[PDB]
Write a protein that holds these residues in place. Structure first.
Motif, PDB file in Angstrom:
ATOM      1  N   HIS A 145       4.832   0.111   0.122  1.00  0.00           N
ATOM      2  CA  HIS A 145       5.376  -0.949   1.066  1.00  0.00           C
ATOM      3  C   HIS A 145       4.594  -1.932   1.569  1.00  0.00           C
ATOM      4  O   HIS A 145       3.393  -1.774   1.391  1.00  0.00           O
ATOM      5  N   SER A 193       4.439   8.487   6.335  1.00  0.00           N
ATOM      6  CA  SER A 193       4.288   7.602   7.722  1.00  0.00           C
ATOM      7  C   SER A 193       5.670   7.557   8.367  1.00  0.00           C
ATOM      8  O   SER A 193       6.648   7.724   7.756  1.00  0.00           O
ATOM      9  N   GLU A 206       0.264   5.326   1.754  1.00  0.00           N
ATOM     10  CA  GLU A 206      -0.719   5.835   2.878  1.00  0.00           C
ATOM     11  C   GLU A 206      -1.824   6.489   2.218  1.00  0.00           C
ATOM     12  O   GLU A 206      -1.917   6.998   1.267  1.00  0.00           O
ATOM     13  N   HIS A 239       0.762  -1.280  -0.059  1.00  0.00           N
ATOM     14  CA  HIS A 239       0.261  -0.036   0.120  1.00  0.00           C
ATOM     15  C   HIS A 239       1.036   1.246  -0.168  1.00  0.00           C
ATOM     16  O   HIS A 239       1.947   1.238   0.631  1.00  0.00           O
TER      17      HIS A 239
HETATM   18 NI    NI Z   1       1.985   2.107   5.832  1.00  0.00          NI
END
Ligand code: NI
Ligand SMILES: O=C(O)CNC(=O)C(=O)O
Ligand SMILES: [Mg+2]
Ligand SMILES: [Zn+2]
Length: 331
Positions: free
Chosen positions: A270, A190, A184, A182
């Motif tokens: 990631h 993040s 963010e 995904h």
């Molecule tokens: Ni994440």
């Protein structure tokens, strides 16, 4: 151009450099860190998140999630089955039980091999997305509960005042617990601090190559891709490093240990897994460089992705054309 190969950079700030969070993110970007999509930050030796972890067993995991896989070893989806509430004490005991414990292994590489070989045949239980913080209120540097908010960043950059708040989340993991591919929400940054326990392995695609991952994902999950033009927002798809290499997708990997921070950069895809019982804390944040990514972020409007209250304002201000459709998917 700094870091043209998009390697994951590792930073060792001094206590002096650890005082100003914004300044140090900017410094990392000056060195090309964002090109990788992910960076590691080792805190100065004088720093501590809190005095001890002795008293955390009474935290409640209200909705533990059993992560059930479908597909083949290198290309699978996972769904979350809700389980009955348990305390961290109970969860940690479960993690350490013969059914769930980390198997014998020689090194991180062997354990990674066993993960990708065997993950699909087990259903580990993840205590994810628990609102709260384990930083001591007296920890002044890199305290994830004391960062400047995304709402204030958007207000400072764009001059608009919006509703919404931004607070951290705790993740309690065990062997094989998995975070799917995904970026963010709204392609924010993040930051993730591994407070205690066993490591976390990460895989990342450079932001400049994110669309190559998306294209491969559409090929590998063809029904999902028909259901939604942004189905990676559902956070259910896994693709192994072997598969990525077979399909020429540029990526990097790194393992995070207790006491280390990771930062993901806007539009840095990631995924990863936990090595055994652990506890991480993470939060989204923004910088002025994020704004252009927030304006361009894909959105899921099929209804699956369902997100926080605070995303409304971001979509409303930054993506007004998308807002009506996106909100239909929220409601
Ligand atoms: Ni994440
Ligand atoms: O730690 C996890 O399970 C997932 N964390 C993240 O995706 C992050 O910090 O961006
Ligand atoms: Mg407690
Ligand atoms: Zn969707």
């Amino acid at each position: 151009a700094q870091n043209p190969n998009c390697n994951i950079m590792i930073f060792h700030p001094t206590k002096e450099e650890f005082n100003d969070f914004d300044k140090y993110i900017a410094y990392m970007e000056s060195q090309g860190a964002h090109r990788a999509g992910l960076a590691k930050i080792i805190p100065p030796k004088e720093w501590k998140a809190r005095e001890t972890y002795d008293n955390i067993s009474e935290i409640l995991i209200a909705t533990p999630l059993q992560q059930v896989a479908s597909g083949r070893a290198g290309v699978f989806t996972q769904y979350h089955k809700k389980k009955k509430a348990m305390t961290v004490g109970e969860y940690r005991h479960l993690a350490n039980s013969k059914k769930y414990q980390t198997p014998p292994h020689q090194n991180f590489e062997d354990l990674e091999r066993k993960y990708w070989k065997n993950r699909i045949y087990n259903s580990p239980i993840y205590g994810a997305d628990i609102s709260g913080s384990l930083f001591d209120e007296n920890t002044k540097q890199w305290n994830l509960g004391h960062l400047g908010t995304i709402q204030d960043l958007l207000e400072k950059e764009c001059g608009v005042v919006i509703e919404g708040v931004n607070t951290p989340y705790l993740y309690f993991g065990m062997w094989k617990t998995t975070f799917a591919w995904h970026t963010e929400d709204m392609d924010l940054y993040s930051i993730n601090y591994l407070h205690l326990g066993e490591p976390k392995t990460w895989y990342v695609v450079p932001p400049e190559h994110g669309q190559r991952l998306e294209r491969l994902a559409r090929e590998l999950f063809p029904g999902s891709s028909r259901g939604c033009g942004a189905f990676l927002r559902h956070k259910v798809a896994l693709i192994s490093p072997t598969v990525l290499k077979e399909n020429g997708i540029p990526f990097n990997r790194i393992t995070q240990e207790a006491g280390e921070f990771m930062v993901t950069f806007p539009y840095g895809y990631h995924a990863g897994f936990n090595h055994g019982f652990n506890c991480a804390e993470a939060i989204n944040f923004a910088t002025p460089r994020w704004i252009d990514y927030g304006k361009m972020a894909s959105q899921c409007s099929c209804g699956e992705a369902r997100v926080t209250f605070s995303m409304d304002a971001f979509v409303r201000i930054l993506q007004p054309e998308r807002y009506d459709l996106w909100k239909r998917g929220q409601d």
